[PDB]
Scaffold this active site. Structure first.
Site, PDB file in Angstrom:
ATOM      1  N   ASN A 103       0.749  -1.377  -0.134  1.00  0.00           N
ATOM      2  CA  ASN A 103       0.094   0.241   0.010  1.00  0.00           C
ATOM      3  C   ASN A 103       0.541   1.180  -0.061  1.00  0.00           C
ATOM      4  OD1 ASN A 103      -2.418   1.765   0.699  1.00  0.00           O
ATOM      5  ND2 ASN A 103      -1.274   1.654   2.782  1.00  0.00           N
ATOM      6  N   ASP A 193      -7.663   5.658   0.183  1.00  0.00           N
ATOM      7  CA  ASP A 193      -6.769   4.703  -0.758  1.00  0.00           C
ATOM      8  C   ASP A 193      -5.249   5.486   0.255  1.00  0.00           C
ATOM      9  OD1 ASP A 193      -4.308   5.123  -2.515  1.00  0.00           O
ATOM     10  OD2 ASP A 193      -4.768   6.434  -3.002  1.00  0.00           O
ATOM     11  N   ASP A 201       0.536   4.986  -6.381  1.00  0.00           N
ATOM     12  CA  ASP A 201       0.470   5.664  -6.532  1.00  0.00           C
ATOM     13  C   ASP A 201       0.314   4.223  -7.992  1.00  0.00           C
ATOM     14  OD1 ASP A 201      -1.497   6.719  -9.158  1.00  0.00           O
ATOM     15  OD2 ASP A 201      -0.758   8.458  -9.146  1.00  0.00           O
ATOM     16  N   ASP A 230      -2.180  -7.199   3.054  1.00  0.00           N
ATOM     17  CA  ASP A 230      -2.483  -6.649   4.212  1.00  0.00           C
ATOM     18  C   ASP A 230      -3.040  -5.432   3.598  1.00  0.00           C
ATOM     19  OD1 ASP A 230      -2.709  -5.377   6.415  1.00  0.00           O
ATOM     20  OD2 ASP A 230      -0.846  -4.667   7.185  1.00  0.00           O
ATOM     21  N   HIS A 234      -7.080   0.007   1.380  1.00  0.00           N
ATOM     22  CA  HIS A 234      -5.960   1.232   0.725  1.00  0.00           C
ATOM     23  C   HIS A 234      -6.005   0.758  -0.767  1.00  0.00           C
ATOM     24  CE1 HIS A 234      -7.255   1.906   4.718  1.00  0.00           C
ATOM     25  NE2 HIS A 234      -6.826   1.403   5.066  1.00  0.00           N
ATOM     26  N   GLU A 260      -6.587  -8.744   4.922  1.00  0.00           N
ATOM     27  CA  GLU A 260      -7.221  -7.753   5.442  1.00  0.00           C
ATOM     28  C   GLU A 260      -7.890  -6.720   4.515  1.00  0.00           C
ATOM     29  OE1 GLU A 260      -5.953  -5.513   8.906  1.00  0.00           O
ATOM     30  OE2 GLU A 260      -4.951  -7.669   9.446  1.00  0.00           O
TER      31      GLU A 260
END
Ligand code: NA
Ligand code: NA
Ligand code: NA
Length: 479
Positions: A103, A193, A201, A230, A234, A260
């Site tokens: 992420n 996000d 990105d 994980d 997002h 998750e």
């Protein structure tokens, strides 16, 4: 084909002694014996510092091998020790799932000048300033690795947001001017996000390809059997799907994948699973919160609702069940800790029932010294005994009283003496007539847990009367 049980093999406050991989190596045979079939290892790659739990995600290609961020080893140990541990797991018939953090990144080597706008924390769609130039921690060069495995370097234009401006030294949620928030993502705070650090990105092809290639490099390096993903609420949905498909392509071995999606809302989870075309499981976060509501409320909680709203109720084949983890533990970000009194009931729910793939938390198995939380190894081992040797065959449920509930498994001819009866109360104790299968008639069943001294003889129609004390659970089997 024993029923599968995974274990998260870390907790937040583990000692930073660099000996955890060696501990895992030496524990492997004992874990196999106890009934663990898969291990979820913490992030194996270099974070912000040596004491990073793993979510720093500085260098995904550094598995405790290069001198970066003030340490060669990760918190857990060296790459060589990790690979030794995995070999030991493999030769004890335990699968290895790698924790995967895509992420964000943290711990950049340098700042870069960046035009940014402040957005509203609770609505990231909405700007609350004009564009201006911040200094952002976006430059990653990986000095010390020196292009081993990958010469890719990260820069600000691979990201779309940070929460720290080094120029004027301020915390704000920043979108990079003329970048978009990722999409589709969870829509709490409008667009969810951005979480922390420098947010990746996925609109850029260089990025898409890099994490696909890193993905496959990692899988091959550690010989993984799967992943925990994980923060997938997002990360743009289309990309997680592309990423998973990519890894299955590249890998000869089967890959189990659990994501998750942290929300107390099974609908949100199901949508995610729609978008993914049911190509992975999710952690059963609403169930986590069911257990925590129960723990917190006490016996007034109506135990008929214990499974209600849960992922496992609706999609047992796509649910990873658990009681607590490194984020639910005391003082942590998603604190929803199941107190000791309720914890055996919660564990029995996920280990002795037919649906879900259950996960045992290291912190419960071995204790959390930081917070004077006892090791519950013996309690858990009995439930593992139940799961591995007795929880087979047709299942019958009895969520029919507000205090006392249970279920049975009739056993299967493949597994001799298999079959079980779980009964529990979150209030005063009691008893319940339950059917365990006409074919078990005349057997005498006793409590694996030791919480109840009753002997339960199965009648001629295949019914037994099972007893539990107050605030307790028992699992009766043919011993
Ligand atoms: Na994100
Ligand atoms: Na919990
Ligand atoms: Na109750």
């Amino acid at each position: 084909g024993l029923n599968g049980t995974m274990m998260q093999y870390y907790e937040w406050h583990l000692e930073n002694d660099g000996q955890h991989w060696n501990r895992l190596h030496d524990d492997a045979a004992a874990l196999s014996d106890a009934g663990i079939t898969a291990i979820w290892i913490p992030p194996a790659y270099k974070g912000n510092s040596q004491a990073d739990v793993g979510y720093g995600a500085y260098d995904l290609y550094d598995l405790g091998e290069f001198n970066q961020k003030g340490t060669v080893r990760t918190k857990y140990g060296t790459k060589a020790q990790l690979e030794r541990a995995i070999g030991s797991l493999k030769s004890n018939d335990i699968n290895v799932y790698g924790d995967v953090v895509m992420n964000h990144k943290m711990g950049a080597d340098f700042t870069e000048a960046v035009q940014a706008v402040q957005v509203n924390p609770t609505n990231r769609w909405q700007d609350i300033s004009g564009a201006y130039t911040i200094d952002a921690w976006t430059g990653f060069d990986f000095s010390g690795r020196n292009n081993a495995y990958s010469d890719f370097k990260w820069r600000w234009f691979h990201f779309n947001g940070v929460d720290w401006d080094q120029r004027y030294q301020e915390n704000h949620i920043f979108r990079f001017a003329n970048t978009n928030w990722n999409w589709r993502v969870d829509e709490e705070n409008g667009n969810y996000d951005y979480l922390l650090g420098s947010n990746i990105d996925f609109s850029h092809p260089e990025v898409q390809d890099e994490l696909k290639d890193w993905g496959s490099w990692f899988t091959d390096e550690l010989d993984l059997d799967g992943y925990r993903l994980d923060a997938i609420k997002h990360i743009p949905f289309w990309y997680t799907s592309d990423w998973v498909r990519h890894q299955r392509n590249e890998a000869d071995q089967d890959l189990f994948v659990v994501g998750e999606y942290w929300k107390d809302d099974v609908g949100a989870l199901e949508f995610y699973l729609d978008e993914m075309n049911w190509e992975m499981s999710l952690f059963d976060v609403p169930l986590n919160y069911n257990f925590y509501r129960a723990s917190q409320q006490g016996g007034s909680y109506d135990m008929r609702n214990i499974l209600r709203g849960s992922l496992v109720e609706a999609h047992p084949m796509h649910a990873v069940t658990f009681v607590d983890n490194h984020d639910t533990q005391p003082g942590e970000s998603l604190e929803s800790w199941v107190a000791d009194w309720f914890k055996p009931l919660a564990y029995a729910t996920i280990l002795t029932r037919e649906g879900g793939y259950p996960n045992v938390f290291y912190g419960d198995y071995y204790g959390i010294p930081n917070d004077n939380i006892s090791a519950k190894k013996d309690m858990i081992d009995e439930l593992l005994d139940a799961r591995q040797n007795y929880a087979y065959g047709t299942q019958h449920d009895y969520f029919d009283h507000w205090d006392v509930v249970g279920w049975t498994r009739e056993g299967s001819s493949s597994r001799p003496n298999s079959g079980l009866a779980t009964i529990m109360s979150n209030g005063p104790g009691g008893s319940k007539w339950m059917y365990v299968g006409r074919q078990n008639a005349g057997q005498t069943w006793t409590d694996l847990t030791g919480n109840n001294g009753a002997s339960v003889t199965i009648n001629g129609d295949g019914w037994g009367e099972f007893f539990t004390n107050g605030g307790s659970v028992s699992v009766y089997v043919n011993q």
